[PDB]
Amino acid sequence: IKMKSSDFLESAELDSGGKVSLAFHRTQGLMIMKTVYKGPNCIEHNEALLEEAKMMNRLRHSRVVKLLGVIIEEGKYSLVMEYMEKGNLMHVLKAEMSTPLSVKGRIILEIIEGMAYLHGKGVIHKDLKPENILVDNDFHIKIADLGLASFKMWSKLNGTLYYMAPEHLNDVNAKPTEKSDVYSFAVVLWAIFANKEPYQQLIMAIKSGNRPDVDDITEYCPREIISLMKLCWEANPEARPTFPGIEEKFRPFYLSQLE
Amino acid sequence: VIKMKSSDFLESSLAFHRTQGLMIMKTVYKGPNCIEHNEALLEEAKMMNRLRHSRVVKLLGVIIEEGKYSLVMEYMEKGNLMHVLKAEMSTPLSVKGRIILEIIEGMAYLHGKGVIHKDLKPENILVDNDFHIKIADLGLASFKMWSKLNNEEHNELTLYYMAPEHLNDVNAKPTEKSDVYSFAVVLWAIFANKEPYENAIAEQQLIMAIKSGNRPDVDDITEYCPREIISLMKLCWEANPEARPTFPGIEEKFRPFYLSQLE
Numbered sequence: 001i002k003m004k005s006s007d008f009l010e011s012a013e014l015d016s017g018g019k020v021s022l023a024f025h026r027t028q029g030l031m032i033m034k035t036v037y038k039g040p041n042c043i044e045h046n047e048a049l050l051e052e053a054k055m056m057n058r059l060r061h062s063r064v065v066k067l068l069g070v071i072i073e074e075g076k077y078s079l080v081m082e083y084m085e086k087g088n089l090m091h092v093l094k095a096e097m098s099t100p101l102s103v104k105g106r107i108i109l110e111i112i113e114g115m116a117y118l119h120g121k122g123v124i125h126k127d128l129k130p131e132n133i134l135v136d137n138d139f140h141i142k143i144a145d146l147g148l149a150s151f152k153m154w155s156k157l158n159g160t161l162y163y164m165a166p167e168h169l170n171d172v173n174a175k176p177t178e179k180s181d182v183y184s185f186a187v188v189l190w191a192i193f194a195n196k197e198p199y200q201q202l203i204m205a206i207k208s209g210n211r212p213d214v215d216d217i218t219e220y221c222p223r224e225i226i227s228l229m230k231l232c233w234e235a236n237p238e239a240r241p242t243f244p245g246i247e248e249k250f251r252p253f254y255l256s257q258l259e
Numbered sequence: 260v261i262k263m264k265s266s267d268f269l270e271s272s273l274a275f276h277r278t279q280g281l282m283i284m285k286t287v288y289k290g291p292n293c294i295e296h297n298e299a300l301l302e303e304a305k306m307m308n309r310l311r312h313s314r315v316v317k318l319l320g321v322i323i324e325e326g327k328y329s330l331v332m333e334y335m336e337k338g339n340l341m342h343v344l345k346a347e348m349s350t351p352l353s354v355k356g357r358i359i360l361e362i363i364e365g366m367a368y369l370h371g372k373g374v375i376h377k378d379l380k381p382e383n384i385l386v387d388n389d390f391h392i393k394i395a396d397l398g399l400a401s402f403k404m405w406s407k408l409n410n411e412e413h414n415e416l417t418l419y420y421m422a423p424e425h426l427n428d429v430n431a432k433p434t435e436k437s438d439v440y441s442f443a444v445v446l447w448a449i450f451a452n453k454e455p456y457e458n459a460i461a462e463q464q465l466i467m468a469i470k471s472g473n474r475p476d477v478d479d480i481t482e483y484c485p486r487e488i489i490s491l492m493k494l495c496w497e498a499n500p501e502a503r504p505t506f507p508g509i510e511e512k513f514r515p516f517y518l519s520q521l522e
């Protein structure tokens with residue numbers, strides 16, 4: 001679960017929309033490394049910082065990012081994850097060539113898959129956003145936690161409200177649920193077909209019922225997907241469906257009309 | 260709780276359900292119906308109905324009626340995997356490799372839910388009109404109560420893919436590794452477009468040969484199976500059950516190779 005800088009034959013640092021380093025590991029290959037903090041070795045939380053890593057490494061699914069390990073040496077604490085060549089969802093959505101409707105259709109279903117898996121494993125994201133959806137060179141996605149919203153030990157060691165559920169806006173104490181991530185998914189649905197980010201006075205608008213304008217989407221989007229985002233960004237969390245329920249409607253649809 | 264009425268359908272078994280599409284039925288028992296033995300039958304069905312995954316068959320319902328105990332599931336138009344590989348129209352590697360990866364995902368799902376198949380074979384791998392697959396249990400090997408109903412007196416009612424340990428004189432209980440062996444043989448048959456061991460003359464010659472280390476003929480599938488899938492099936496059909504990899508382990512090995520060389 002823990003690696004050494006020496007296990008990497010070569011490495012390069014790339015800054016993206018951040019401060020990550022790509023390295024070629026001997027046996028496994030290309031991985032992304034990020035130094036969480038720099039300073040003297042800790043004494044209080046080092047034991048459970050290695051256990052957090054073990055818990056995350058055991059979330060294995062095709063649509064979910066796998067934490068490969070941790071590098072702890074001479075006052076450095078760094079997480080190691082797999083490499084997604086094309087960066088994140090918005091980078092791919094703002095590219096010159098338009099992403100085919102078929103590929104956008106497949107991405108949505110893969111976001112559903114990864115989300116249904118994490119929920120089934122008792123994991124609530126609370127930070128689902130295009131910046132957290134990582135795309136490989138084959139246009140397949142993996143859900144990541146780059147804002148350390150689920151890495152509580154690693155968060156202590158060292159933000160978009162456009163995707164945040166209204167129940168969480170001006171109510172930090174409310175517990176994040178499966179319905180919190182469904183709301184974020186609806187805004188992700190919008191950002192996919194609109195190919196851009198949506199939108200104190202904004203927060204009260206979103207709390208009243210204001211949502212990203214469907215009319216702002218220029219390119220072609222099915223009426224059925226429009227209805228799916230509307231339903232998922234519903235004010236009452238109880239009215240919103242679950243990811244296995246989104247999947248049982250989206251999968252036949254994708255297979256009949258988009259694949 | 261998820262019990263179907265015959266009212267929705269028509270007789271054949273094969274029926275169109277209003278609002279749920281075409282379905283295939285299996286009438287397991289025809290005779291006197293009694294409420295006591297039925298809960299055990301309804302509960303087991305509710306148990307299978309909760310194995311929900313894109314690559315595993317979802318039992319939709321049961322029809323417990325007078326003179327009819329039936330299992331209901333969605334009809335897979337192209338039949339089993341074997342019928343598809345043996346068809347006139349040749350299947351390209353991209354489709355075969357996607358089929359292989361679907362099997363792994365289905366099996367990783369079932370194992371993660373504690374389900375050990377015990378009867379993994381091309382006959383239990385079902386295909387739709389879009390060349391996507393589902394893992395079934397047509398032999399009722401996991402259906403303890405429905406299988407017992409299928410063996411009554413008052414009622415009207417394989418070898419090539421079995422692990423060496425189960426062919427053995429010892430014949431211990433199945434494991435996850437038992438299914439990994441079955442998978443290795445299916446991998447070979449996907450690339451051979453036929454059942455293994457054609458050159459076998461006697462069943463006991465076969466049984467003793469597998470226990471000794473005989474496996475499907477690798478030379479018959481170098482036309483054309485990548486060296487990667489060959490090493491994989493060789494690893495999955497190892498004599499020692501503890502030396503076989505896990506399905507999530509096989510998934511982490513097959514997914515990157517399929518994306519670069521086959522998709």
Ligand SMILES: CN1C(=O)[C@@H](NC(=O)c2nc(Cc3ccccc3)n[nH]2)COc2ccccc21
Nearest residue numbers: 032033034065067079080081143144145146150
């Ligand atoms: C280098 N790098 C990482 O390793 C990052 N890892 C993940 O985002 C990660 N998501 C999962 C799956 C998961 C687990 C829980 C919830 C959702 C998904 N497992 N790990 C965190 O730190 C970074 C921060 C910024 C850039 C790079 C990194």
Ligand SMILES: CN1C(=O)[C@@H](NC(=O)c2nc(Cc3ccccc3)n[nH]2)COc2ccccc21
Nearest residue numbers: 283284285316318330331332394395396397401
């Ligand atoms: C009508 N019909 C069915 O429903 C058949 N069902 C399945 O094979 C089935 N596999 C699973 C998942 C699963 C669960 C455990 C292990 C593997 C897979 N769930 N159901 C059984 O009986 C039949 C016999 C013949 C034709 C049709 C049917």
